[PDB]
């Protein structure tokens, strides 16, 4: 249980800086966890951060009109591909943009909406 926690949380802490109250509160959760109650409260605080991040992903489509600007915002957001909660907000435009670049066909233009290590994804394999 500890190893899974560290595997998730070290990844989150290291990579979220890549993409201040957000970092203070994840550090606060790490302070609290350092067992079932602590784990549940940690999940509550992290998933609340994820919902706030999902609102930012909603603002993504809110702002831009053309593909290129949404692609720029996707490039700005790499930390969240690993997390399988943002994958819903990411999947919603993933079809919209992968089908767009498929119609346009560019390797960079395809990678940026499926993230690093696209070789695992089913749609990227084709």
């Amino acid at each position: 249980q500890m190893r899974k926690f560290r595997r998730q949380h070290e990844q989150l802490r290291a990579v979220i800086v890549r993409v201040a109250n957000a970092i203070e509160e994840v550090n606060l959760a790490y302070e609290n966890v350092k067992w079932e109650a602590a784990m549940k409260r940690y999940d509550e605080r992290i998933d609340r951060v994820e919902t706030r991040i999902t609102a930012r992903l909603r603002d993504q489509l809110g702002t831009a009109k053309n593909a290129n600007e949404m692609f720029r915002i996707f490039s700005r957001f790499n930390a969240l591909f690993v997390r399988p909660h943002i994958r819903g907000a990411i999947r919603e435009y993933q079809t919209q943009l992968i089908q767009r670049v498929k119609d346009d066909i560019y390797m960079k233009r395809v990678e940026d909406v499926l993230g690093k290590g696209w070789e695992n994804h089913v749609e990227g394999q084709k």
Partner: protein, 358 residues
């Protein structure tokens, strides 16, 4: 005091048709969409009907009328598209009606493939912000499909709802917390109430709530927002002659309200008063329970004329007027009295204290 305001009923359309669902528009509060089922007697008439009535005018007839090939069981104004009216069908097929278009026939219609819905769709709702929002639909086979209002040919996302590894959850009703777009609570025909997550590592069913010994008819989360955060609470109403108040924290019922003598078909929290909700019974009784005033008896009660079974209840967005839909298909609106509807400023802390008493 509850006072009769307006009966809504069409000779051609609503006769011999129960009201399957009601809903009030958000931006035009005077409007009220109401779906209906197939008329048994007349096969030639369309199975599904949906009438958008208007309270502003005195005209008895509906403001708009729509119909579709299969009986409508859910209906909802697209919360961020005023020109649209979404509805489910018994055939398991979302139908979208555009009021601007002159077609009573649906302009768009979802498939009936395996990926899309196939079983009846009793719950449809738009969730999200105006910048981005999705039409979530849940069938009675546990399938929940995300749909974009612009294009309905392909499902945005398709997933099944399950508990205890493989056991289908026959969702009969569904609600969302105010301001939450990931968590929701779905009542089941099995009598269990499931808290489920739309996106997440544990996407799907998250928690099981037991206590209802009959099929769940109507679930609704808390709507009123004030100083104190009561978002976690929600009220269920089930065929076991009970309404039950729950919190998402507690796995067991917070309380049980059973002053009835029949099934309870639909319950809804008031949208302005924190401790007020309303439940509609099978004996034709609409019962407003204000839990601050008294908890063991309804605060107010009014019976429709003729004692029809009352399938649905929907408060207005103002909370002053409440529409109830009966088996006859008459949409009777009631005016809720001043002393009941508008809350005292201390009603929030008062309901907090009553919760502390429980």
């Amino acid at each position: 005091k509850l006072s009769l305001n307006r009966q809504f009923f069409d000779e051609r359309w609503s006769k011999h048709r129960v009201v399957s669902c009601l809903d009030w528009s958000s931006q035009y509060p005077e409007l009220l969409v109401a779906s209906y089922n197939n008329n048994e007697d007349a096969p030639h008439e369309p199975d599904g009907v949906a009438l958008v009535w208007n309270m502003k005018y005195k005209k008895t007839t509906p403001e708009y009328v729509f119909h579709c090939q299969s009986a409508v069981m859910s209906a909802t104004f697209a919360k961020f598209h005023p020109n649209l009216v979404v509805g489910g069908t018994y055939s398991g097929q979302i139908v979208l009606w555009d009021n601007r278009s002159n077609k009573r026939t649906p302009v768009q219609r979802t498939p009936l493939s395996a990926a899309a819905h196939t079983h009846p769709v009793y719950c449809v709702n738009v969730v999200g912000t105006q910048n981005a929002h999705n039409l979530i639909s849940i069938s009675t086979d546990g399938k929940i499909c995300s749909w974009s209002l612009d294009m309905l040919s392909h499902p945005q996302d398709s997933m099944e709802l399950v508990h205890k590894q493989s056991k289908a959850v026959a969702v009969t009703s569904m609600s969302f917390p105010v301001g939450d777009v990931n968590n929701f609570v779905v009542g089941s025909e099995e009598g269990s109430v499931y808290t489920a997550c739309r996106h997440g590592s544990k996407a799907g069913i998250s928690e099981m709530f037991e206590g209802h010994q009959g099929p769940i008819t109507g679930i609704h989360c808390h709507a009123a927002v004030g100083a104190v955060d009561f978002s976690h609470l929600f009220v269920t109403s089930s065929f076991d002659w009970t309404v039950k108040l729950w919190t998402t924290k507690n796995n067991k019922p917070l309380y049980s309200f059973e002053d009835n003598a029949d099934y309870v078909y639909d319950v809804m929290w008031s949208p302005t008063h924190p401790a007020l909700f309303a439940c509609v019974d099978g004996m034709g009784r609409l019962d407003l329970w204000n839990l601050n005033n008294d908890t063991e008896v309804p605060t107010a009660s009014i019976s429709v004329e003729g004692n029809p079974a009352l399938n649905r209840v929907r408060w207005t967005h103002s909370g002053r007027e409440i529409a109830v839909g009966d088996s006859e298909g008459q949409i009777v609106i009631y005016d809720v009295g001043e002393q009941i509807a508008v809350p005292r400023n201390d009603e929030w802390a008062r309901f907090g204290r009553t919760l502390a008493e429980i």
